[PDB]
């Protein structure tokens, strides 16, 4: 005479005194830190910086998506605190789950576009500049909003308030009926919410890794030649000359490997001349002719009296790229595994309430690590900007 009455297979699954106490406490921390954290991000990025880059648009919408999810968070904290009892009705049930699902798909899709933007702004800054305008930045977002809504559309449909017959506990959840709701609901979160975005983000930063590694390896090969060439100028015997000429010959071969991305045949031929000029200098060092080999190595720098500006570069960028990929991986792979197991329990192989408990006990644990590490995404991505860090520390 009202809502749908459901029989629960494993009613005592995930119900523990330590889950009802720790989970709402962590939700309050995520609520306090998330709101205080993300709100200040949207201030600096809009009122202090006026949104003039494409990443600035992605960063603002990334923080607003987290802010929308945090507003519905007080509903889930008390929901867990009441031993999973939902009094908020069916209206807030369809909205709370949709808001959590929408913002989780939107935040991951936004991190995907941010990676594609960094790959374009680094490897091809000149060509991709005219394509990456401010209009495309706002158009990309409304495509993400529509995709995050369409992917979370089954969440607004199959999320009803149910009354368990054998426990008299009214809950808001998904009804995994025997047959006659799609099982692809849990799959979409695994492939569209993790697999597909991770393979695109990893490919972007890996291509940035290989692009920056080639640039720094080439920069260090020239540094290897110039530094060793100054050792010949201050050399004494033929042993100290051959030791430096042997290191320069390997550096010329390593620099011959780098190739961005007839023009490249001229690049490698320019180093075959370099290696060839090192061979003759090595021939004089093997015979024991120091002052003659010193002139052969000094004629090498004939192509080069004003000191020029040095190329700025950081060796710590690889720590950032690796941390960015791992911080996204190890923050969703706990929730993605226990969700994949749920798909096996949903309609398949697993028929045991003893292991269905470890799924419902560790699910809010994985939701907290997914929620806490995602609500800090716009903050830490923003700290990677020298201009953003200065304004944020002033507030």
């Amino acid at each position: 005479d009202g809502i749908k009455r459901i029989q629960d297979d494993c009613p005592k699954a995930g119900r523990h005194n330590y889950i009802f106490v720790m989970i709402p406490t962590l939700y309050s921390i995520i609520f306090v830190v998330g709101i205080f954290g993300n709100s200040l991000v949207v201030i600096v990025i809009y009122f202090y910086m006026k949104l003039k880059t494409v990443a600035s648009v992605f960063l603002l919408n990334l923080a607003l998506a987290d802010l929308c999810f945090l507003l519905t968070l007080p509903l889930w904290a008390v929901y867990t605190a009441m031993e999973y009892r939902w009094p908020f009705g069916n209206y807030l049930c369809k909205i709370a789950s949709a808001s959590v699902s929408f913002n989780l798909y939107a935040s991951v899709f936004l991190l995907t576009c941010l990676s594609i933007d960094r790959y374009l702004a680094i490897v091809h800054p000149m060509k991709s500049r005219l394509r990456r305008t401010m209009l495309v930045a706002k158009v990309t977002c409304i495509i993400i909003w529509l995709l995050a809504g369409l992917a979370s559309l089954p969440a607004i449909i199959h999320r009803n308030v149910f009354f368990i017959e054998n426990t008299n506990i009214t809950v808001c959840a998904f009804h995994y009926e025997s047959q006659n709701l799609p099982i692809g609901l849990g799959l979409t979160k695994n492939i569209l919410g993790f697999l597909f975005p991770f393979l695109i983000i990893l490919t972007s930063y890996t291509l940035i890794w290989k692009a920056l590694k080639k640039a720094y390896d080439l920069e260090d090969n020239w540094e290897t030649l110039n530094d060793n060439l100054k050792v010949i100028e201050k050399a004494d015997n033929a042993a100290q000359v051959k030791d430096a000429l042997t290191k320069m010959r390997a550096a010329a071969l390593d620099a011959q490997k780098a190739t961005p991305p007839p023009e490249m045949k001229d690049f490698r031929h320019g180093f075959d001349i370099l290696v060839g000029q090192i061979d003759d200098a090595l021939k004089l060092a093997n015979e024991g002719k120091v002052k003659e080999a010193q002139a052969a190595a000094e004629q090498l720098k004939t192509t080069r009296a004003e000191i020029q500006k040095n190329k700025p570069r950081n060796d710590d960028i690889f720590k950032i790229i690796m941390a960015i990929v791992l911080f996204f991986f190890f923050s969703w792979i706990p929730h993605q595994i226990f969700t994949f197991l749920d798909v096996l329990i949903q309609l398949g192989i697993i028929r045991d309430c003893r292991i269905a408990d470890i799924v419902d006990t560790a699910m809010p644990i994985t939701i907290c690590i997914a929620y806490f590490n995602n609500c800090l995404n716009p903050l830490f991505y923003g700290f990677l900007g020298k201009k953003f860090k200065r304004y944020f520390l002033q507030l």
Partner: nanobody
Amino acid sequence: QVQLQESGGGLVQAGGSLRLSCAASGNIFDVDIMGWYRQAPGKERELVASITDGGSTDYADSVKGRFTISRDNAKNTVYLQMNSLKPEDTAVYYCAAVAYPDIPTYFDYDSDNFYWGQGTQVTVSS
């Protein structure tokens, strides 16, 4: 801020030649990549050419064979040798560059590590 001083644009006969120089100022370190963009009246901006700090150039199909770009790493100045200036080359030629900070984390929400110039008008009369 990194400013880009441009010079060499003016009214010139069709089929002649012109050289555009763009020097970078206010940059403590070297400039990563520099290039040239032109804005035709009533059109959108177009990439003319670009050159890497190592010497790799990339021209557009609009100026192949007639335009040649080079750079001086000592002066951080790029030259756009525009030979056989056709009346279609009449546009506002902007200078572009990519400059990274001292310890550069390749994230920039203020300028995106991309700096423009004032621009010079290059009018080609026939």
